[PDB]
Protein backbone atom coordinates (compact mmCIF):
# COMPACT_ATOMS: atom_id res chain seq x y z
CA UNK A 1 0.00 0.00 0.00
CA UNK A 2 1.57 3.25 1.19
CA UNK A 3 4.61 1.31 2.42
CA UNK A 4 4.86 -0.29 -1.03
CA UNK A 5 4.73 3.19 -2.60
CA UNK A 6 7.53 4.33 -0.26
CA UNK A 7 9.54 1.23 -1.21
CA UNK A 8 9.17 1.84 -4.95
CA UNK A 9 10.01 5.54 -4.52
CA UNK A 10 13.17 4.55 -2.63
CA UNK A 11 14.00 1.96 -5.30
CA UNK A 12 13.67 4.52 -8.09
CA UNK A 13 15.73 7.06 -6.15
CA UNK A 14 18.45 4.46 -5.59
CA UNK A 15 18.36 3.50 -9.28
CA UNK A 16 18.83 7.09 -10.41
CA UNK A 17 21.55 7.51 -7.76
CA UNK A 18 23.35 4.50 -9.25
CA UNK A 19 22.91 5.98 -12.73
CA UNK A 20 24.40 9.31 -11.62
CA UNK A 21 27.26 7.47 -9.89
CA UNK A 22 27.90 5.50 -13.09
CA UNK A 23 28.06 8.72 -15.11
CA UNK A 24 30.47 10.23 -12.56
CA UNK A 25 32.58 7.06 -12.68
CA UNK A 26 32.81 7.05 -16.47
CA UNK A 27 33.71 10.75 -16.44
CA UNK A 28 36.47 10.53 -13.84
CA UNK A 29 37.73 7.36 -15.56
CA UNK A 30 37.62 8.87 -19.06
CA UNK A 31 40.95 10.15 -20.38
CA UNK A 32 41.70 12.01 -23.60
CA UNK A 33 43.26 10.19 -26.55
CA UNK A 34 46.70 11.64 -27.26
CA UNK A 35 48.59 11.00 -30.51
CA UNK A 36 52.13 12.18 -31.30
CA UNK A 37 52.65 14.66 -34.15
CA UNK A 38 56.05 14.14 -35.86
CA UNK A 39 57.64 13.94 -32.38
CA UNK A 40 56.70 17.59 -31.75
CA UNK A 41 53.66 17.20 -29.49
CA UNK A 42 50.93 14.72 -28.54
CA UNK A 43 47.80 16.04 -30.25
CA UNK A 44 44.28 15.26 -29.06
CA UNK A 45 42.07 12.66 -30.75
CA UNK A 46 38.64 11.23 -29.98
CA UNK A 47 36.69 14.35 -30.91
CA UNK A 48 33.71 12.47 -32.35
CA UNK A 49 33.09 10.04 -29.50
CA UNK A 50 33.98 12.67 -26.89
CA UNK A 51 31.30 15.00 -28.25
CA UNK A 52 28.89 12.07 -28.60
CA UNK A 53 29.39 11.11 -24.94
CA UNK A 54 28.97 14.72 -23.80
CA UNK A 55 25.74 15.11 -25.78
CA UNK A 56 24.36 11.76 -24.59
CA UNK B 1 60.82 36.64 -28.20
CA UNK B 2 58.40 36.95 -25.25
CA UNK B 3 59.89 40.06 -23.62
CA UNK B 4 58.99 43.67 -24.44
CA UNK B 5 61.40 46.62 -24.58
CA UNK B 6 60.62 50.13 -23.32
CA UNK B 7 63.18 52.90 -23.74
CA UNK B 8 63.64 55.39 -20.91
CA UNK B 9 66.01 58.33 -21.38
CA UNK B 10 67.15 59.86 -18.10
CA UNK B 11 68.48 63.39 -17.73
CA UNK B 12 69.73 65.55 -14.87
CA UNK B 13 66.25 66.67 -13.79
CA UNK B 14 64.73 63.18 -13.83
CA UNK B 15 62.26 62.34 -11.06
CA UNK B 16 60.40 59.05 -10.44
CA UNK B 17 57.38 60.73 -12.08
CA UNK B 18 58.87 59.54 -15.39
CA UNK B 19 58.83 55.92 -14.20
CA UNK B 20 55.30 56.40 -12.89
CA UNK B 21 54.13 57.85 -16.22
CA UNK B 22 55.69 54.94 -18.12
CA UNK B 23 53.88 52.57 -15.75
CA UNK B 24 50.59 54.39 -16.35
CA UNK B 25 51.07 54.16 -20.12
CA UNK B 26 52.25 50.55 -20.36
CA UNK B 27 50.66 48.82 -17.34
CA UNK B 28 47.47 48.54 -15.29
CA UNK B 29 46.63 48.43 -11.59
CA UNK B 30 44.40 45.55 -10.48
CA UNK B 31 43.29 44.73 -6.95
CA UNK B 32 43.95 41.25 -5.55
CA UNK B 33 43.26 39.78 -2.09
CA UNK B 34 47.04 39.67 -1.58
CA UNK B 35 47.26 43.35 -2.49
CA UNK B 36 47.45 45.85 -5.30
CA UNK B 37 49.64 44.61 -8.15
CA UNK B 38 51.05 46.06 -11.36
CA UNK B 39 51.57 44.08 -14.57
CA UNK B 40 52.03 44.89 -18.27
CA UNK B 41 48.99 45.26 -20.50
CA UNK B 42 49.58 42.21 -22.71
CA UNK B 43 49.84 38.95 -20.79
CA UNK B 44 52.61 36.38 -21.01
CA UNK B 45 55.39 38.91 -21.66
CA UNK B 46 57.93 40.56 -19.36
CA UNK B 47 58.37 44.33 -19.62
CA UNK B 48 61.91 45.72 -19.78
CA UNK B 49 62.50 49.35 -18.81
Amino acid sequence: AIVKDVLLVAQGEMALEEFLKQIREVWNTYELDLVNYQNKCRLIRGWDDLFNKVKE
Amino acid sequence: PDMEVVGLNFSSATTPELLLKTFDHYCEYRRTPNGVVLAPVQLGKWLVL
Partner: protein, 48 residues
Protein backbone atom coordinates in the same frame (compact mmCIF):
# COMPACT_ATOMS: atom_id res chain seq x y z
CA UNK C 1 52.72 25.27 -37.75
CA UNK C 2 53.11 23.13 -40.87
CA UNK C 3 53.27 26.13 -43.19
CA UNK C 4 55.51 28.23 -40.91
CA UNK C 5 57.90 25.30 -40.36
CA UNK C 6 58.12 23.50 -43.71
CA UNK C 7 57.72 26.54 -45.95
CA UNK C 8 60.79 28.76 -46.27
CA UNK C 9 61.12 32.51 -46.99
CA UNK C 10 58.22 33.37 -44.65
CA UNK C 11 60.68 34.60 -42.02
CA UNK C 12 62.27 36.96 -44.55
CA UNK C 13 59.01 38.06 -46.17
CA UNK C 14 56.82 38.23 -43.04
CA UNK C 15 59.22 38.66 -40.10
CA UNK C 16 57.01 40.24 -37.43
CA UNK C 17 54.15 37.87 -38.29
CA UNK C 18 56.31 34.76 -38.08
CA UNK C 19 57.78 36.11 -34.82
CA UNK C 20 54.28 36.43 -33.38
CA UNK C 21 53.64 32.89 -34.62
CA UNK C 22 56.61 31.48 -32.71
CA UNK C 23 55.55 33.52 -29.66
CA UNK C 24 52.08 31.97 -29.72
CA UNK C 25 53.31 28.49 -30.70
CA UNK C 26 55.52 28.33 -27.60
CA UNK C 27 52.52 29.12 -25.38
CA UNK C 28 50.30 26.57 -27.14
CA UNK C 29 53.01 23.90 -26.90
CA UNK C 30 53.52 24.62 -23.19
CA UNK C 31 49.80 24.31 -22.46
CA UNK C 32 49.69 21.15 -24.60
CA UNK C 33 52.58 19.66 -22.61
CA UNK C 34 50.68 20.45 -19.40
CA UNK C 35 47.60 18.71 -20.83
CA UNK C 36 49.74 15.69 -21.76
CA UNK C 37 51.14 15.66 -18.22
CA UNK C 38 47.61 15.62 -16.74
CA UNK C 39 45.49 13.81 -19.36
CA UNK C 40 42.22 13.69 -17.38
CA UNK C 41 39.26 15.63 -18.76
CA UNK C 42 38.32 16.95 -15.31
CA UNK C 43 41.95 17.96 -14.71
CA UNK C 44 42.34 19.84 -18.00
CA UNK C 45 39.01 21.52 -17.28
CA UNK C 46 40.18 22.48 -13.78
CA UNK C 47 43.53 23.98 -14.81
CA UNK C 48 43.62 27.77 -14.54
Amino acid sequence: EGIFTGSADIKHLLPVETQRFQSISTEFLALMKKVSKSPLVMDVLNIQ
